[PDB]
Amino acid sequence: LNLDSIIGRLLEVQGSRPGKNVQLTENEIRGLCLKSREIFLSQPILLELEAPLKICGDIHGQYYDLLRLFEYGGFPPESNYLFLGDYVDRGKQSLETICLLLAYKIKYPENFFLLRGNHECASINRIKGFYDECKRRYNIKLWKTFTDCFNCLPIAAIVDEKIFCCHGGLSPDLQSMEQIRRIMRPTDVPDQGLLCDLLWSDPDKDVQGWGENDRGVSFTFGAEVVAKFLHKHDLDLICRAHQVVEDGYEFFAKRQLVTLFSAPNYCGEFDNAGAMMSVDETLMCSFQILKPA
Ligand SMILES: [Mn+2]
Ligand SMILES: [Mn+2]
């Protein structure tokens, strides 16, 4: 697997008209999936990470915005990175997006990290775009290969014992971090339970305790649920993604939770910015922001 050739071709379109494809070979992408899958399984499902690092929310196949994020934040390994999931679907270039991310994971496995979003799940990305991209530009066997890889992604991360990170949010079934560590891989995303909630739940300002989620999956949780979680586990901040927010980032529960969304102008019918959170050595948070067009 010629990793540097793959990364070079993926980065070659920097400065091109947004939309220009990078078409790797089928064997190259299969190798990216197989090798990254091995690395994901070799690392904990609950990552224990160190600052400084940069944290990114949803990308949803907006490959040229991913390139802008790296241009702003420093291409790996000049900065350490944690991504919070939802790499595919909706956008036009899920394939270039996920291939660059997997290539950086293989090249910099201790300095580059990917969590699982609810779209890294076959039943979701069958309908929402990624299956169609694979069928058109490669074949469905490659889509299954991607699925096998997604099923091994880690689910959450803790930065310096203080910042808890996942795609969705908290769970009424999450009482101990050991519950996350005991989750076995590979796995699909179940329709209920701890793993589902970590990828699907949402914070809600108008909810007390746990409420019903409008997505039809998982729950909503209020500010008191966040405060109790931080106190019980001696944490300072929940960092999650999953929801479009106008500024690219949005604090919640007196800045005890932050939502990150890194795909600007989402789907075309969203005038949102995309944001990336910079976490310095003392865990102080700042933002780099792709303003809407
Ligand atoms: Mn999303
Ligand atoms: Mn999501």
Instruction: Note the overall shape.
Output: globular
CATH architecture: 4-Layer Sandwich
Computed over alpha carbons, the radius of gyration is 18 Å
What distance lies between the first and last C-alpha atoms, to the nearest angstrom? 38 Å
List the domain count as a whole number. Answer: 1
β-strand number: 14
CATH class: Alpha Beta
Number of helices: 10
Strand content: 15-25%
The hetero compounds bound to this protein are: manganese (II) ion
CATH superfamily membership: Metallo-dependent phosphatases
Q: Give the SSE string.
A: HHEEHEHEHHHEEHHEEEHEEEEE
| CATH T-level fold name | Purple Acid Phosphatase, chain A, domain 2
Neighbour order of strands in the largest sheet: 1-5-6-10-12-11
> What is the helix content?
25-40%
Helix/strand class: alpha/beta
Query: What characterizes the major β-sheet?
Result: 6 strands, mixed
Summarize the structure.
With 293 residues, the protein is an alpha/beta fold. The protein has ten helices and 14 strands. The protein has one domain: Purple Acid Phosphatase, chain A, domain 2, CATH 3.60.21.
Written description of the protein model:
- The structure is a monomer.
- This protein is an alpha/beta fold and 293 residues long.
- The chain has one domain (1-293): Metallo-dependent phosphatases (Purple Acid Phosphatase, chain A, domain 2, 4-Layer Sandwich).
- The strands form 3 sheets. Strands 1-5-6-10-12-11 form a 6-stranded mixed sheet.
- The chain has helices at 3-12, 26-42, 63-73, 94-107, 122-125, 130-137, 140-150, 177-181, 194-200, 223-233, and strands at 46-49, 53-56, 81-83, 112-114, 156-159, 163-166, 202-203, 210-212, 219-221, 237-240, 249-252, 257-260, 274-279, 285-290.
- Bound molecules: manganese (II) ion (2 copies).
- The site of one manganese (II) ion has 6 residues, from loops.
- It is classed as hydrolase.
